[PDB]
């Protein structure tokens, strides 16, 4: 995943088999070192 903090993102094609892509908005995720982004909304995630 490409997580952008307090901004936006654009998908991009990669002509692979059954290439699903979806951009997401409203994520507040965790890693081991605590939270990744800080803006509650305005976060972004890409699932390919």
């Amino acid at each position, epitope marked *: 995943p490409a997580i952008k903090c307090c901004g936006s993102q654009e998908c*991009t094609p990669t002509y692979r088999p059954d290439e699903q892509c979806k*951009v997401f908005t409203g994520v507040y995720p965790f890693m081991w070192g605590g939270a990744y982004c800080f803006c509650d*909304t305005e976060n972004t995630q890409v699932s390919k």
Partner: antibody
Framework: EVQLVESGAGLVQPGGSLRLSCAAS????????MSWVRQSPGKGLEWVGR??????????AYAASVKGRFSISRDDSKNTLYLQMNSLKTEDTAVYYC???????????????????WGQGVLVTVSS | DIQMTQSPSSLSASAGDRVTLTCRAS??????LAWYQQKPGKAPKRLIY???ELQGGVPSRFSGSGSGTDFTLSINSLQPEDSATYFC?????????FGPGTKVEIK
């Protein structure tokens, strides 16, 4: 904040030629789907056109009422989106908006992009 | 051309309440609906895209839910900065048709 500024509008001798331009700044320009929309009195918003990026060939899909008359021709040497309108009718006049189209899901190659951003808008006056 | 209907067209209310809006479609558009907003003499604003993903910059009292031909736009709290015309967008198959609009007003 993506920046967009409409320019080149005003009064016209109808049935003829005209140009509008959108001097953009705030995103990767040569990898950007961009589009136009127009708003009419008494009638809502009509999509006019969408131009594609250099990784697709700078192709341009249009609408029904404008095939062969409206043509989009961008250029990467200057971040600016052109629209060279031709053979003006009496309903073509409308408040135009240049827009950016962020792609949000690519399902089996062909992608799908809404209208993210907008310009301030400009008035085109087709009368006599 | 997918002729939409942006129904209702007059759904005024008062503060603190809840209100909804519909943009129903002929063909089955999967989730590629975008609820927008417009104000007097200003440009529009993307509110919700993909029917379930709120745009970055929009207060959370708006919310999306729907698929196919039937969709919603739930305002959990109509504070008075929402005097506006709300639209709906379709970007699965050209032409990129909109609904006519709904003129949400207040007094």
């Amino acid at each position: 904040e993506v920046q967009l500024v409409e320019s080149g509008a005003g009064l016209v001798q109808p049935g003829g030629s005209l140009r509008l331009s959108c001097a953009a700044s705030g995103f990767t320009f040569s990898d950007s789907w961009m589009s136009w929309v127009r708003q009419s009195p008494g009638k809502g918003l009509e999509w006019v056109g969408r131009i594609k990026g250099k990784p697709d060939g700078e192709t341009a899909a249009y609408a029904a009422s404008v095939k062969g008359r409206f043509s989009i021709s961008r250029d990467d040497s200057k971040n600016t989106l052109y629209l060279q309108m031709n053979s003006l009718k009496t309903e073509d006049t409308a408040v135009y908006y240049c827009t950016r189209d962020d792609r949000t899901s690519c399902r089996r190659g062909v992608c799908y992009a809404a209208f993210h951003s907008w310009g301030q808008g400009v008035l085109v006056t087709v009368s006599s | 051309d997918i002729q939409m209907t942006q129904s209702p067209s007059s759904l005024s209310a008062s503060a603190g309440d809840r209100v909804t809006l519909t943009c129903r479609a002929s063909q089955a558009i999967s989730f590629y609906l975008a609820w927008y907003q417009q104000k007097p003499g200003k440009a529009p604003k993307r509110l919700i895209y993909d029917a379930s993903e709120l745009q970055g910059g929009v207060p959370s009292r708006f919310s999306g839910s729907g698929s196919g031909t039937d969709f919603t736009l739930s305002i959990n709290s109509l504070q008075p900065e929402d005097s506006a015309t709300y639209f709906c967008l379709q970007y699965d198959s050209p032409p990129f048709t909109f609904g006519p609009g709904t003129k949400v007003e207040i007094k």
